[PDB]
């Protein structure tokens with residue numbers, strides 16, 4: 001099937017914002033039920049001491065960021081929080097480990113977790129890093145509906161942010177999950193230092209794949225004292241907007257999840273975003289380790305804009 | 313004569329799922345206007361201060377504190393002066409605004425003389441002097457005046473709680489005087505005076521079901537001013553000041569909806585939402601009549617971020 005050239009995507013990032021937003025909606029409405037948004041709540045199955053060196057992450061053992069390092073929680077502890085989240089109203093549960101790759105000793109537990117979450121009635125999706133053909137097929141057999149694995153940016157920039165991994169090294173993991181028979185959730189971050197071109201490259205990347213990701217998160221950089229990116233220039237909202245617009249147009253059939261950084265965004269913006277095409281969010285006090293808009297505020301905005309039949 | 317919007321037909325909109333409403337909005341707007349293109353009018357207060365009327369929201373009302381340096385009508389030069397700096401400044405239409413109930417015959421020669429200079433200076437001329445009368449209108453028109461401002465502020469069924477020194481009708485009368493005069497009508501209202509979804513509805517529904525709805529339809533957001541009885545008021549959720557523009561856009565396609573008064577209080581995104589909503593005119597400058605307004609640069613800058621106009625240098 002036809003793909004996207006780069007000088008074909010840069011076109012968008014250059015298009016008159018407003019007009020782009022229009023096409024955006026135009027598209028979105030042709031493939032999704034507007035006023036309807038996807039709600040996934042996640043927790044950190046295991047947080048803290050992390051090997052890799054992402055210039056943006058606060059869990060990287062490579063930096064200060066004084067983070068209370070915790071150790072993988074028992075299957076109960078997970079299913080516990082999983083429950084409060086189901087009842088809390090979320091549809092999909094997202095466990096996230098702070099690893100490079102899971103360990104064989106882990107699997108039995110990771111597996112056991114998906115079990116409970118899958119039977120509990122909600123969707124199960126975890127992000128454990130680079131899993132391998134074996135692990136995948138195991139997670140899939142257990143249940144896991146989705147797997148998270150981001151590209152963060154253009155391959156031509158991945159270097160300035162992440163080094164402990166091959167840009168390719170990730171692509172490989174997606175396909176492992178693809179063939180595994182699990183849904184792929186892949187996305188990036190905005191405002192790492194990247195440029196209009198870089199971002200372009202990112203979408204352009206996970207866009208020209210065998211079968212683009214079902215869910216495409218677009219996080220806005222969460223500056224954290226310690227991480228080398230901490231002291232960074234904030235991204236004009238309008239640019240974090242446009243990014244969603246492009247993504248929506250570029251992958252119609254895909255769920256664009258306005259995530260990470262909503263807490264920093266204002267009402268209107270999120271509105272702009274949803275309009276832009278964004279149709280999924282993380283719902284809750286916190287996501288992995290940073291702050292997130294509180295359930296109520298979320299629920300309240302959800303209605304102001306008139307999204308969902310989740311009013312009581 | 314043509315069709316008229318029912319009320320239970322407009323309340324429908326104010327109830328419609330915001331986002332979806334915004335869509336129709338744009339849908340409509342694009343069918344009657346050149347998006348990415350916005351109208352720029354800059355105004356000044358030909359005469360400010362001591363005002364007779366008692367609008368619960370206005371800071372010029374002689375009825376309240378608001379410590380406003382009361383100034384007296386400026387000479388024709390003083391006006392044309394500021395008028396010039398504003399033309400060069402890049403604005404298209406000039407808007408003089410007096411703080412009167414109605415102009416005085418002694419005024420006219422000067423008001424007339426003003427329109428003269430502004431009209432010849434090369435830009436559009438529009439002034440708001442209150443309730444002018446058949447005579448005055450035809451005089452202003454003969455001089456040049458392209459537009460006349462006269463707002464309805466809200467539903468007739470609420471006008472009372474805000475304004476009392478005038479008959480809701482008393483204004484309608486003035487519009488028509490201007491209509492027949494052969495001048496463009498700029499009529500609009502304010503949001504967040506205390507009004508309710510229904511009230512607002514009534515407002516649009518009002519100036520919407522007229523002989524020929526106003527070319528320009530301003531929609532000001534209430535500017536709380538210490539002193540005015542409205543000062544201590546609940547702020548209006550942006551999303552509601554948004555929706556209001558949406559409805560107006562749909563309800564009067566052929567009309568210019570001017571996002572005005574209160575932009576200074578609004579944030580980037582909102583104005584964006586607004587323009588998208590249908591809003592396509594603004595007041596450009598440091599100040600409008602007496603409150604603060606976003607500075608030319610900030611304006612020009614946002615204008616480009618969103619990609620509006622060929623006004624880039």
Ligand SMILES: C[S@@+](CC[C@H](N)C(=O)[O-])C[C@H]1O[C@@H](n2cnc3c(N)ncnc32)[C@H](O)[C@@H]1O
Nearest residue numbers: 056057097098099128129150219220221222288
């Ligand atoms: C919570 S992590 C877990 C990643 C997993 N350990 C791996 O690397 O396989 C998933 C994504 O969260 C995003 N993220 C984490 N911390 C962030 C921050 N402080 N600011 C912005 N995005 C962040 C990054 O895009 C990251 O790849």
Ligand SMILES: C[S@@+](CC[C@H](N)C(=O)[O-])C[C@H]1O[C@@H](n2cnc3c(N)ncnc32)[C@H](O)[C@@H]1O
Nearest residue numbers: 369370412441442463502532533534535573601
């Ligand atoms: C500058 S005034 C002059 C009106 C003129 N004297 C008349 O009565 O015909 C025009 C409109 O500005 C709006 N306005 C003035 N002050 C305002 C404020 N503080 N907040 C919101 N709107 C205001 C009101 O709708 C007012 O009728």
Ligand SMILES: C[C@@H]1NC(=O)N[C@@H]1CCCCCC(=O)O
Nearest residue numbers: 096217219222260287288289290
């Ligand atoms: C795993 C989820 N997928 C994603 O793209 N972002 C979430 C991770 C958290 C991002 C915000 C920074 C933090 O983790 O504290």
Ligand SMILES: C[C@@H]1NC(=O)N[C@@H]1CCCCCC(=O)O
Nearest residue numbers: 530532535572573600601602603
């Ligand atoms: C005359 C113009 N028409 C209108 O609706 N607003 C302008 C007047 C100013 C509104 C904001 C409050 C002030 O006057 O300072």
Ligand code: SF4
Nearest residue numbers: 050052054057060098
């Ligand atoms: S992002 Fe994933 S890999 Fe990079 S440091 Fe944080 S947890 Fe480890």
Ligand code: SF4
Nearest residue numbers: 363365367370373411
């Ligand atoms: S709004 Fe126009 S009329 Fe009402 S008090 Fe102020 S100047 Fe006088």
Ligand code: FES
Nearest residue numbers: 094125146148185
């Ligand atoms: S993180 Fe679980 S689906 Fe995107």
Ligand code: FES
Nearest residue numbers: 407438459461498
């Ligand atoms: S105020 Fe002069 S045109 Fe609306």
